[PDB]
Automatic annotation (TrEMBL):
Designated name of the protein: Genome polyprotein
Species this chain originates from: Hepatitis C virus subtype 2a
Section covered of the full-length record: 2443 to 3005 of 3033
Domain RdRp catalytic: 212-330
Subcellular location: Host cell membrane; Host cytoplasm, Host perinuclear region; Host endoplasmic reticulum membrane; Host lipid droplet
Top-rank lineage group of the source organism: Viruses
């Protein structure tokens, strides 16, 4: 079947769209080549639609059947429950897209009678009708990038049901997202990990092999490769858990009416097309992708003769570390792996390549690198090319962003030279000038939404990354070259200039005393001649972030404070 069919009606914008970074002194202080930074818009929506529309031919085999059997048995060990109305409403992001039925996320979170009554009606309808397709809206995502000299990306398409239904999805399936992926694939489930824990996983996988070989598998348009049969198989796995009857009913109904497919409408209410693949904007997008990617990949390893594979799966993102069988053998085996995945309906975008140096292996755009700590010992940490984070940071400096990305990048990538020298310096300067340092901000991390104050950063970073995160130095040539290159490409000041600026930002923060001074002392210890001795923060001991990433369920309409 075709992933999508289209009526010919346009994919229309909801709000005003801008294609290019504004010319503005605030953003200009971060990067000067504003023409290189663009935002995807509906203008490219039809082009994306064409790319993601194709025929899926799926042929499963005995390798696939055997993995699925194991997975269903593992799922039977899980016990899960419905979430209450209250619980589901409190997981709704404050800026979640409003309902067509006359209420918004504000009303959901405050449990207003109108909203709660509506959701109760949607739930009742799910239990009573297991067949009528649920309408979805399709929109072009507005996301910011830098041009790639290798021109502009087409907008990603988001397909999602009404706010009333999204709350119901949580009641039916949220508890499952918290328990099922771990039960089925254990340590291979990537969304349960902080950046430091992802680093540890990868280092351990690498070190376990006598002769390690790694690859990342880039599926071409993963959501589009997900078949109706894949989605009903996902249902079978969710329902292998021990659940109340009401949960079985709601999950079957959501599967048949929403997850397996349905009609898409544009923002104008015109019928736009029909989907027969993964919806990009449902609660189960990440969990579903993770499980389905895992079954297909583990099965493909077996068919391909990939030896002792250790996999890290984050939605559609897949890394496999295994025992090298020799250079030529690895290349042949990776081709066999790709052929198997293709039969399973997961053909590659860029073909995988055997990699023999862990620093160069990317998982979710990120890689492990190494630096030195305060006492000169080697310390590993997670990093990534800073181009997109910095381009988005510039945009978000000058355009209202109710859910920003920069605060998530600072938190996730706190130990990195670029988040510290560039992002922290820039934003503490902006926030002090606006006098909004103490205000809580919503931000994305792993596709889920969180809320913290910039003044919370030292405690958060210590808790997630350790005190060393304020003291790393002597980064690798790969990392230094990459960062310097990205800054030059963007027309951003070089790292040395950020250090000049940071001395002033640090001084300003310290002059304020209190929590702001703690930020100056801890976050900018790298920018002072005589380093202060940094000691554990009392604040950090009051934080339990152990399931902070798990609760995000790998992304979606999910919010945590």
């Amino acid at each position: 079947s075709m992933s999508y069919s289209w009526t010919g009606a346009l994919i229309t914008p909801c709000s005003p769209e801008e294609e290019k970074l504004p010319i503005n002194p605030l953003s200009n202080s971060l990067l000067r080549y504003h023409n290189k930074v663009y935002c995807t818009t509906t203008k490219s929506a039809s082009l994306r639609a064409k790319k993601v529309t194709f025929d899926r031919m799926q042929v499963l085999d005995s390798y696939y059947d055997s993995v699925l059997k194991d997975i269903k048995l593992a799922a039977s060990k899980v016990t899960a429950r419905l979430l209450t109305m209250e619980e589901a409403c409190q997981l709704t992001p404050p800026h979640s897209a409003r309902s067509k039925y006359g209420f918004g996320a504000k009303e959901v979170r405050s449990l207003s009678g109108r909203a709660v009554n509506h959701i109760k009606s949607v739930w009742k309808d799910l239990l009573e009708d297991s067949e009528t397709p649920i309408p979805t809206t399709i929109m072009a995502k507005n996301e910011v990038f830098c041009v790639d000299p290798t021109g502009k990306k087409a907008a990603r398409l988001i397909v999602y049901p009404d706010l009333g239904v999204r709350v119901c999805e949580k009641m039916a399936l949220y508890d499952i997202t918290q328990k099922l992926p771990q039960a089925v694939m254990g340590a291979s489930y990537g969304f349960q990990y902080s950046p430091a824990q992802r680093v540890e996983f990868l280092l351990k996988a690498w070190a376990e092999k006598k002769d390690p070989m790694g690859f990342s598998y880039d599926t071409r348009c993963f959501d589009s490769t997900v078949t109706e049969r894949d989605i009903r198989t996902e249902e079978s796995i969710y329902r292998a858990c021990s659940l109340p009857e009401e949960a079985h009913t709601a999950i079957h109904s959501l599967t048949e009416r929403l997850y397996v497919g349905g009609p898409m409408f544009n923002s104008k209410g015109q019928t736009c097309g029909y989907r027969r693949c993964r919806a990009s904007g449902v609660l189960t997008t990440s969990m579903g992708n993770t499980i389905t990617c895992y079954v297909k990949a583990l099965a493909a390893c077996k068919a391909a003769g990939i030896i002792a594979p250790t996999m890290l799966v984050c939605g559609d993102d897949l890394v496999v570390i295994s025992e090298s069988q020799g250079t030529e053998e690895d290349e042949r085996n990776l081709r066999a792996f790709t052929e198997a995945m293709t039969r399973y309906s997961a053909p590659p975008g860029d073909p995988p390549r055997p990699e023999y140096d862990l620093e160069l292996i990317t998982s979710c755009s990120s890689n492990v690198s190494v630096a030195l700590g305060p006492q000169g010992r080697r310390r590993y940490y997670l990093t990534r090319d800073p181009t997109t984070p910095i381009a988005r940071a510039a945009w978000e400096t000058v355009r209202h962003s109710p859910v920003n990305s920069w605060l998530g990048n600072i938190i996730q990538y706190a130990p990195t030279i670029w988040a510290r020298m560039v992002l922290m310096t820039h934003f503490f300067s902006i926030l002090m000038a606006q006098d909004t340092l103490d205000q809580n901000l919503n931000f994305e991390m792993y596709g889920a939404v969180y809320s913290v104050s910039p003044l919370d950063l030292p405690a958060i970073i210590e808790r997630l990354h350790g005190l060393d995160a304020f003291s790393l130095h002597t980064y690798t040539p790969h990392e230094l070259t990459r960062v310097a290159s990205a800054l030059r490409k963007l027309g951003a000041p070089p790292l040395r200039a950020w250090k000049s600026r940071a001395r002033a930002v640090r001084a300003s923060l310290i002059s304020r005393g209190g929590r702001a001074a703690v930020c100056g002392r801890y976050l900018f210890n790298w920018a002072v001649k005589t380093k202060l001795k940094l000691t554990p923060l009392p604040e950090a001991r009051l934080l339990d972030l152990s399931s902070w990433f798990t609760v995000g369920a790998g992304g979606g309409d999910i919010y945590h404070s």
